[PDB]
Amino acid sequence: MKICLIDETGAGDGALSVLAARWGLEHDEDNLMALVLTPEHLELRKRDEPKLGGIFVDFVGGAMAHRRKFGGGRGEAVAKAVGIKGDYLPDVVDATAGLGRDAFVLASVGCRVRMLERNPVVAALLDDGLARGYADAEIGGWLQERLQLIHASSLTALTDITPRPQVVYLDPMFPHKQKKEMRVFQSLVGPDLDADGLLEPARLLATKRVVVKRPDYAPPLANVATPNAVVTKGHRFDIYAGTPV
Numbered sequence: 001m002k003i004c005l006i007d008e009t010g011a012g013d014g015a016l017s018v019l020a021a022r023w024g025l026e027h028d029e030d031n032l033m034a035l036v037l038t039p040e041h042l043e044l045r046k047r048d049e050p051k052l053g054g055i056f057v058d059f060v061g062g063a064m065a066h067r068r069k070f071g072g073g074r075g076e077a078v079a080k081a082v083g084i085k086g087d088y089l090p091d092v093v094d095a096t097a098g099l100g101r102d103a104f105v106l107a108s109v110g111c112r113v114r115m116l117e118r119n120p121v122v123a124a125l126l127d128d129g130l131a132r133g134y135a136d137a138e139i140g141g142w143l144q145e146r147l148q149l150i151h152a153s154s155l156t157a158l159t160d161i162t163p164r165p166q167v168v169y170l171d172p173m174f175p176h177k178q179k180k181e182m183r184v185f186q187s188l189v190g191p192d193l194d195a196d197g198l199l200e201p202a203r204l205l206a207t208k209r210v211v212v213k214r215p216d217y218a219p220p221l222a223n224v225a226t227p228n229a230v231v232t233k234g235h236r237f238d239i240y241a242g243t244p245v
């Protein structure tokens with residue numbers, strides 16, 4: 001995948017070159033997007049709009065830490081959609097990791113989560129955040145145990161997932177027509193054209209449920225209607241049945 005690779009570490013140890021090789025990234029000097037390795041973290045920038053700043057995955061601070069403390073945890077809309085209740089903490093597979101925001105919430109409540117991400121740049125950003133997260137003296141311990149990243153496509157990797165999770169969470173990038181962070185991220189990640197193909201394999205893998213995030217008025221994934229869903233402001237979480245063992 002092409003992208004402008006920028007080194008702002010001053011180390012000269014080849015960290016960026018190793019990272020590009022590992023994720024199969026190709027340097028593109030005139031690319032609209034830039035992946036920058038800084039002394040603090042790996043971030044993504046929209047070169048034509050510096051005012052938007054850079055975005056990076058941070059499980060320890062910022063917005064994720066604020067949501068963990070004030071979001072409600074088991075009380076979150078996504079947590080109730082996955083079925084979290086009482087001492088029931090299902091194993092979850094987030095087939096569309098992205099920035100890992102929803103994944104982190106579920107793992108923070110107590111769920112064991114496996115994240116899948118096929119975009120090499122996104123995966124690189126998540127892996128850097130995970131490295132910093134695992135290193136945290138406070139959450140590093142449980143984070144490493146309840147949140148793992150898998151670089152693969154859920155369209156074909158979901159089938160052979162073992163052990164089978166009770167729930168599969170789906171939030172592919174929808175073709176939005178209607179903040180800074182989102183503008184930068186969406187400039188990289190366009191609509192996932194083959195998203196409708198995730199429902200079938202997801203319902204076969206999950207033993208209990210499949211949750212699909214959908215914005216208001218957006219059609220259900222794969223046009224498969226469902227009577228169950230958690231509704232919040234702006235979006236809803238469609239709930240489907242899985243395939244019991």
Ligand SMILES: Nc1ncnc2c1ncn2[C@@H]1O[C@H](CSCC[C@H](N)C(=O)O)[C@@H](O)[C@H]1O
Pocket residue numbers: 095096097098099100101102103116117118119122152153154155156171172173189192
């Ligand atoms: N088959 C697939 N396998 C892995 N990742 C996939 C995928 N189809 C789409 N994706 C990823 O799914 C992500 C959805 S973006 C949503 C991010 C997430 N809801 C959050 O909490 O932030 C995108 O980054 C896209 O690259």
